[PDB]
Amino acid sequence: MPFHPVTAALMYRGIYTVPNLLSEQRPVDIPEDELEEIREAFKVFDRDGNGFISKQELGTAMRSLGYMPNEVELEVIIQRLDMDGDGQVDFEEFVTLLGP
């Protein structure tokens, strides 16, 4: 058997090589090529690079898009992502809300 993950569970003998090309054929799913964009974005704004983004740091991210938040606003925006309550936002928390 090939080390290749997932090959074909069906197909007894009398069959070309097509499994389900009459239903969907080509699969629909954005390649991780888009995921790497998630990091480089908010991750670079992390001046400490500790892997977490604080309020003062996140305040530099929003302004970049064209939304400059005040010292009073960047506080309520960070609590929207920070569900665990660590003062900073973790990759995962932001990676899920970035997708379906």
Known binding residues for Ca(2+): 46, 48, 50, 57, 82, 84, 86, 88, 93
Look up residue 46 and give its DSSP letter.
-
* 57-64 long-range contacts, CB within 8 A, separation 24+: 58/89
Q: Which of 46, 58, 61, 69: binder of Ca ion (CB under 5 A)?
A: 46
Q: How far is the CB of 84 from Ca ion (least distance, A)?
A: 5
Q: What residues contact 14, with CB distance under 8 A and at least 6 apart?
A: none
Among 34, 36, 37, 48, binds Ca ion (CB under 5 A): 48
Which residues lie near Ca ion (CB under 5 A)?
46, 48, 50, 82, 84, 86, 89-90
